Amino acid sequence: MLRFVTKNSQDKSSDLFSICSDRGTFVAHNRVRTDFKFDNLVFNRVYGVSQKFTLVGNPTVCFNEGSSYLEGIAKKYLTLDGGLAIDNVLNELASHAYNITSWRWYDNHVALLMNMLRAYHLQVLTEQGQYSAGDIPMYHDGHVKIKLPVTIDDTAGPTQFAWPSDRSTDSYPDWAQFSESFPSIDVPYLDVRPLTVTEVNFVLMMMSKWHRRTNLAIDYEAPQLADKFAYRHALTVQDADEWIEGDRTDDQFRPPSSKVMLSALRKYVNHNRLYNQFYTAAQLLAQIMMKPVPNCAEGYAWLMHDALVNIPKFGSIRGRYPFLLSGDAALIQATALEDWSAIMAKPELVFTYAMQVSVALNTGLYLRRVKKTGFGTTIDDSYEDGAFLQPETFVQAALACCTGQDAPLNGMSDVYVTYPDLLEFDAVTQVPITVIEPAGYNIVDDHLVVVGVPVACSPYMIFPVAAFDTANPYCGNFVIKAANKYLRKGAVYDKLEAWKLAWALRVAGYDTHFKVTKFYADNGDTWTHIPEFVTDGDVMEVFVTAIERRARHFVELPRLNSPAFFRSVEVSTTIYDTHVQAASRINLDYVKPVSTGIQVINAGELKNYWGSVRRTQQGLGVVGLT
Amino acid sequence: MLRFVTKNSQDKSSDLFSICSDRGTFVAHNRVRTDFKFDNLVFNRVYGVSQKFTLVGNPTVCFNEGSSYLEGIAKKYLTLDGGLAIDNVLNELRVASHAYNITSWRWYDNHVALLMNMLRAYHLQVLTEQGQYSAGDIPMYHDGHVKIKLPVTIDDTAGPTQFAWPSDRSTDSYPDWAQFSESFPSIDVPYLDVRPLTVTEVNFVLMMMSKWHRRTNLAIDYEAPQLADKFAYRHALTVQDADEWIEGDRTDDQFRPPSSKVMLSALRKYVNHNRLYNQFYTAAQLLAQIMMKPVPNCAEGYAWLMHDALVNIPKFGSIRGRYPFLLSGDAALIQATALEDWSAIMAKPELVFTYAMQVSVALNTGLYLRRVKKTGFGTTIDDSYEDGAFLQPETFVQAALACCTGQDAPLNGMSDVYVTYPDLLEFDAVTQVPITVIEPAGYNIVDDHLVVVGVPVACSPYMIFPVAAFDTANPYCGNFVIKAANKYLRKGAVYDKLEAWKLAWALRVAGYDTHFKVTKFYADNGDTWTHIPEFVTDGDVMEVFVTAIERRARHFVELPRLNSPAFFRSVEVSTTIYDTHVQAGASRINLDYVKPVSTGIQVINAGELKNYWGSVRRTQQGLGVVGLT
Amino acid sequence: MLRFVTKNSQDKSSDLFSICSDRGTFVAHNRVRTDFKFDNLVFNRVYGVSQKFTLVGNPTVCFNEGSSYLEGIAKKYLTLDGGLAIDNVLNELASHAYNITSWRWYDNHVALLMNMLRAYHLQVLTEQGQYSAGDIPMYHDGHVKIKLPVTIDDTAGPTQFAWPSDRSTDSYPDWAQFSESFPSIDVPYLDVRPLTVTEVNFVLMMMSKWHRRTNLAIDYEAPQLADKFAYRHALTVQDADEWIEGDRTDDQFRPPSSKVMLSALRKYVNHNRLYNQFYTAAQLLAQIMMKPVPNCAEGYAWLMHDALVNIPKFGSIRGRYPFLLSGDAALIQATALEDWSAIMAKPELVFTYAMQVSVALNTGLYLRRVKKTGFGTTIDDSYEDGAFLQPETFVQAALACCTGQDAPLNGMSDVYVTYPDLLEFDAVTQVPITVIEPAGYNIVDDHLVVVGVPVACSPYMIFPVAAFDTANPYCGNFVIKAANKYLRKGAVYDKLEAWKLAWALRVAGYDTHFKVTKFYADNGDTWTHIPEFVTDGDVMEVFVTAIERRARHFVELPRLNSPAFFRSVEVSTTIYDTHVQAASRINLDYVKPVSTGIQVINAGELKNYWGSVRRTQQGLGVVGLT
């Protein structure tokens, strides 16, 4: 994910942002200058654009077991594939020799790593002093009032990060202390030797069942990862045990700080060599993290829609034997290693990547819906069902169709964040609406309806996004061309050319009408949504009438509508300064990972989904890392 | 299937009609203009010709054992010649044999029955939401003379007006299902992968996995037991809404069957995910071939309508959700015809219904065509017509289609599947028709029962007009000339049988009925088509006498005395279609939307006739099964 | 046997059929079209032919020990030949070192595998709902009534598959549970670890003595395979023990279903790597399975004659040590492996191969008897005693002489299905006959007699059978040629030409007379038996008189008897559709076996009889696989 973020703008920028919330939402502000050069008369207008985001969500999570991955053990303990070298293990150690015939090796700690990630982010948020239940923004446009419900009330919601479980009200895993060389039960054991006492306590107690107490998307409900397990440690750690039996009071046993929690993460991962599984965990957390708050009224359907996540069941063989984590670690992906090094250099790469993936996902789904019609795209590709069926490649396909670069795959099989109710282009949403005054809006029975996925963000977190083959507002610059034909009342225009002209005029300060009435563009973002009527098929020409001016006008432009006054206006848009408000630039040359004691493979296996998906000219598809 | 409808791209386009039917039947209107060119000037008549089709049928189903096919499996485990690589799947299994003995031995992937069930449910729900789903009712034949009325197993008026679930709650058992996400299969049992389906679509799929109760007389509501006794589905979320409805927890109101769009999306998602293009192609072929029959406008024509078809739908088996990595990779040797036909159906679902309408007419006409072309109007001495394609039940419908129309009939693309009529293999097959008591006029009624030999023509060719059924010019060709009689005598105007029928048809269109000897030309008003009389087929005769040509009450374009010299003029007849519309109670398609998905799909145009990937071609020597080339 | 069945017709067909019975007999129907092209006038006649089969038989089985075969152990545990590598075993493990000097290694489980095969087929038959005692058909031809006796009466015979043994009325093997690494007694032990509890129970209890309770040929009597043994399993299984001591009632302890029985078969074979021994077991079961019901009256001598089977005594060393079944399995025949993969893909390959081998065996014996005389064959080969003396190559020699392809050998030494009373050409049979009306029949003292072996089937399960070098009805097509000389009353004809003419005329619908009176051909099969008088020597010419027509006549043909009207009639016969009635096509590309972890040898050793026998021009003989 490091390559994706560092390639959205340029290899030199590498701009990162920290987590911030304000009752569950935050706003990312920008400052952008737009040019207008025509007849060697360069004009410009500098303005600020704001795209706010919300961390409130209610994703659905299913905990279903999957494949077993052993890409962290020594070379001699692995065969030519991911399967362990059982003969080597036994020629090293009996009853176990006969027992092994009945010991499946299901080692997959992705659920644990994701749990630690969300707990760390929650603790960072509460030490930042703004952790709360989280509430959706209340959007009101003079004509329509909307307010999506949330389960947990913010005011009564907790302000401090409590432990996910309860006071012994629910059962807890039967943990144990392990120091021998003989695994006694096929139940998984962990190896937490480098961890300190408090880190081990946090790990074991958070293994227990998690309860959802806030509307935060990373606060989803999760059951206990394993009913029984043991940890291979030098000493027994039992402070959390005193807490469950009802001895340690809340004040002395509180969730550990962010620094120690991140340290426990680091120790766990780089002692068990879980770089691949942690990369998968970070990918899933980034894809589940947050959604943008829509400026337009109909964009709230994106907020109401809930993702579906498939986290594999927890299993471990690392702690079963102590020599497995020794030796030379094998089959570690270079992308996973570099991503791990970067995220432990700065732990907010996940946050900035999550915001970028949210914006890219929304725009990719919407542009798939639009480019189905034939707007901007030459080839009538199978956008509907091509690479969006594969749940693991769903969000990556959306990112590829939006941005055009190689979206990083989950790196793990049978894990995905998927919107099942979004593959169809007929899917509707009933957003609650208390209409203030009647206007142009498809308001039927107190809820307007939307078709497919709407726009809820603006392509400003990722600006140079190459959505279309030709120049467009999504691209850096475009040239407004002559109309197809001019008439008395106006001129006809192609779908894309008309939208480009309307966008440029809205930035300049002109309101643009059309027939077969307004090009919508909300203030505070000044990005013109694609018109609903032109979105559908059978419409190839747009009649532009009445290019009127607005109350506030910035750049004064020719008519471009009358043949006499049309001029080849060439525009150009560049983003200058961004600052979230509820930098931190990274340096690749200082975060390079540890190549020693690690065997690194550049390529991956398509079964395990170690690759990327790129929007080819002939159609987007999955490709190998090679 | 698409190429057959488009007649191999008639101006790169064709036309389709959606399914619509009232009381189990629907008319199929037409408007044509028939010319008459004599004395170097042209007369014409514009008349509306209709055709009645019925969805009612009672085919005999046979869910017997069938072969397995692994076409939608990744390219690295299948192979064109090396076939299934069991070494590769054992390696990628993650000892090996310890998994072999459990489940890795069967390899019985076949979902044809499930796809057919989903398709018929889609059709039934379409009829339901169009306000036209009801119990079937075969029309009656009122003609003043002998009248025919047939019974129905379920009464129409008491018949249900709403498509409820096929199975009946609290009467029969259901397959035992439970979500399964384990990498390692545990029990040898069909595992079907439904991961990307929504809750309602996966619910609909697993509910249609159950057994099917017939609640109507329609031909696509045939009985079907539960496809698998036990099974498990690969899905992230455990779905039990169907299970709740199995018990009393969920009521009938809250588990109504979904809309047609939801079932269509479920079918699209299933076939796209599992790469079931060929299997769905076979399912669509079978369902269309059993869809419907044309209601005759003649008396002896109902004998064809009495017959019931026998279908070989293979027993269900799914090995695609056992291993997640089976579908990871481009599909193996998917037929190009299957891909294009799948894209066409998903774009326009009415293609299956239109192809069914075309196939019913083509088959009913081609059975008559073969019963005649075997003897060649009785001037063929030996048995060197090679009609043996009619023998094996699989190429029955295909051979009938190829014999009726010169186009290559599409093979079923699957082995041990067919739609066949066992008792009509031989052309000397007698059938009895229950008949009401009315005085006769030469309908050879025996014991108050029409005795019918062979198979009768029951439909007009107006939906496939360029049929080219016969070699010579004729009404089937559309344009023909009427020549002078061979020689004139007292009885009058010796005519060859085929030319006599051509003259009779043209005169009946023009408003003159004709009298023959060795007596008239009983035809239909609504459908001014005159079906070929038995003197053409019998082959005992080679010349026929036309005694008098009289004027009907409904006179039309005026002609001279054709059956006499010094008065006959060589009129010529040409007809063109003005407007066709299938009403009851259209959607243009061109070859622009045919473009199939070729991203990550290995496509082979060639096929092997062992698996029935070809097309039967009619030549002058006879029929012949030809591969896909 | 897969190559034989798939080569009888063509590599593409591969047609298989399931087991079905109707009071012990079933009928296989066909639909065949016969052509008659002459003077460019192609005529044809389509008709159905039915050849019924019977599963009732009383074979004689002798349980005599033979060679010890060790072609399933690892490479290091075997020497350059089948003998085990005793030095390698001992340098792996003592008293055993001294004990071994007195441990013969007799490992041969063919009797066990055959017992499981017959039990599985019986359970399939009873779950099909038609299992019974089985009764021979009662054939009656208006002139003669015959009904062969059977020991068990069908009506009182059991309808459900009971366990072969009794209620502790007979003694049972003293089984034991083994888990150590030390074999305590030279008594054999088995290794049944992958088997479940019920599969182990079925295996051990069916090891006990088998009792014949029905007239079925696969229900032959067999004693207990071993008085003592032990099974190497994780746990003791004793439900069948409770059954023998008289505790578990019949209802809870019933014979396992077909699926679990086949699963036990699969587990046993592919864990002990008994592919060769199982191939031998399937061969023997196929050769013993069934016989055809004869349409002609004198053909019932084939029914009365009983085969002789030599099953080796049961012995096992697989369960003695647990490491033997590990490693790389050695010396596995490719034919055996592919046959095993096919039969576990579909378990009815054995049934279809058994029906084919029955038809081929009868026709091969009869054609050996006929071709002794000189009918059709040029060389007076030693058909009487050449390759029919070797009991193991008896049935294979019959198949080779019939069909002409390579009959698959038993793949095991000192095992055979042999008819000792059939090598002579003078062997007679006294079939019981209640004669209805006197006619042409050699009826002496209430029993007609037959000489040698008669025809009891028709070559329709295997049609393209190349019995003779020249064209014939057994071949696809033949041309009726001009007579040697024409006389006033008729024309003379060679033996084979006269029989070809008579067969063609009977298919057409003409009855053919001859002198030095009728060419017999029964309806429902319309295949003309070779005339008895022309069968013997010293007769080279046949006088054909009076080619009269029949009651039902299909194809109208020239006289072919008078020189004026003789025409070069060319016939052609093809089979279109078959359907047994008391398909299932196989696909070779999907049933390919597991080549990994198995060492496969194409060639075999003539001592062990790993080969095939082909009818060469100069004479049939055994050849190697090479």
Numbering used by the authors:
A (entry chain A), C (entry chain A): 1 to 93, 105 to 527, 535 to 600, 608 to 651
B (entry chain B): 1 to 94, 104 to 527, 535 to 601, 608 to 651
Text taken from the publication that reported this structure:
S. cerevisiae, a genetically well-described system, harbors in its genome an endogenous virus known as L-A virus, a member of the Totivirus family, and its discovery was the main starting point of research on yeast virology. The L-A virus contains a single 4.6 kb double-stranded RNA (dsRNA), encoding for a capsid protein (Gag), and the viral RNA-dependent RNA polymerase fusion protein (Gag/Pol).
To derive solid molecular insights into the L-A virus structure within the cell extract, we acquired an additional cryo-EM dataset at 0.93 Å. A high-quality de novo model was built in the derived 3.21 Å L-A virus cryo-EM map (FSC = 0.143). The backbone was explicitly traceable; the α-helical pitch and β-strand separation were both discernable. Side chain densities were clearly visible, which allows us for the unambiguous placement of most side chains. The icosahedral protein shell has a triangulation number T = 1 organization, consisting of 60 structural units, with each unit comprising two chemically identical capsid proteins, formed by 120 protomers, with overall diameter (400 Å) and thickness (46 Å) comparable to its crystallographic counterpart. A similar opening diameter (18 Å) at the icosahedral fivefold axes was observed that is hypothesized to serve as a gate for the exit of viral mRNA and entry of nucleotide triphosphates. Detailed analysis of the L-A virus identified previously undescribed stabilizing cation-π interactions in the capsid that mediate interactions within and also across L-A protomers. In the asymmetric unit, 26 side chains are involved in forming 11 distinct cation-π interaction networks, formed within monomeric and dimeric interfaces (examples are shown in Fig. 2c). Structural changes compared to the crystal structure are detected in both capsomere subunits, specifically in loop regions (R94–V104; Y528–K536, G601–H607) of protomers A and B, respectively. Specifically, the flexible region spanning residues 528–534 encircles the active site. This loop element undergoes dynamic changes as it was not Cα-traceable in the cryo-EM map; however, in the crystal structure it was resolved, pointing to a regulatory role in the binding site accessibility.
